[model samples]
Target: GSSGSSGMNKPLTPSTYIRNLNVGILRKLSDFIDPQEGWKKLAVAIKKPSGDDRYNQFHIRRFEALLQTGKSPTCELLFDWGTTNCTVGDLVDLLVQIELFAPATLLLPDAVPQTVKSLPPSGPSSG
Candidate 1:
């Protein structure tokens, strides 16, 4: 999609009503992030952030560092530098320390989006 992005590549939105994330292959950060599309900008900006958006910037930078440098720093390392409120990234860091992220291969959607509107209403479309 050269025109723009699908916009689904963000951190999963917070929700009181949640689904079982284990229902799918999203057990890895690589699963959540689409490398070529979703994560290139953040990965490329490893040491280069545009401005002082500490939470987002630091999270991405730290992620890229661990990913690139491949050093397993513990969560305690956060006292020196850490995200302000980037919880998704914090989990990503934690999981990375746990060392189970899959390689960034060509991951495809389990199923693409489809519309069901054309189907008749189950019982009440008789007006």
Candidate 2:
């Protein structure tokens, strides 16, 4: 049977666990704002291209690629590997950057679809 044996624990899958954790984190983040309107504000600010905007773009692109390819960033893996390549102080900085960028990247597609569409499509085959 698919159920665990009487004395054994059910095996858990890494990908499944990660997906669940990511969903929970996203849910918490969404709860912090209006969801519909908060993202729109973030999207506009991101497009303006300032100091924060640049950092936001970098992190957001990295995160998006990670999502698509199931790859973890060096910083993330370093933490997982019990290495101190990035210190606690560095984490604070990264969190601040992530907080600033999260909404911009997550909400931009829905909040500013027309603006996104205005950009030149990538690849010669885009028609």
Candidate 3:
């Protein structure tokens, strides 16, 4: 028993992040997406570890079935992805690609800032 990764700056990896996420939060995020189009787009984008495109059809069908129950299917889908080749990073990228910007940003960590600092005018500062 040598050591644990306690020294690491980034505590959560993509897979672990989703796997450990609260279902409530995940479901709420899912609601931001269009059930049919968003689901299909993600399935295609992530594909499978085998790189087979045909597998997406099955995913779509299953997602639809889960959605039909009136409960959140997103949690199940994300948990499943964590077990497969789909990392949360790729999922975020796909979310951005599909224009789900709000949800995408919500998934990102605060370690990376997207805003630029604006400079104050020199004349105004020279009191």
On lDDT, the candidate that comes out on top is 3
Poorest lDDT segment (10 consecutive residues) of candidate 3: 116-125
Global lDDT of model 2: 0.33
For 1-127, candidate 3 gives per-residue lDDT tens digits of: 3333332233234544466666665775677754645756665666555766733575677877777786556666777776664555676777767665555655654323444222223332364
Ranking by lDDT: 3, 2, 1
Shift of residue 67 alpha carbon in model 2, Å: 23
Better of 1 and 2 by TM-score: 1
Model 2, 55-89: lDDT tens digits are: 25545455446435754332232223123122322
Clash pairs (backbone) in predicted model 3:
none
lDDT of 1 by residue, 1-118 (tens): 1243224342343221112223243434334443432343323222324545333555556655755665322221222233323333443333333332322111222111221112
**Residue pairs with backbone overlap in model 1:** none
The TM-score leader among the candidates is 3
TM-score of each: 0.26, 0.23, 0.61
Where in model 3 is the C-alpha error above 4 Å?
1-17, 34-36, 109-127
Deviation in Å, model 2, residue 116 alpha carbon: 35
The regions of model 1 sitting more than 4 angstroms off are 1-20, 27-34, 37-54, 70-127
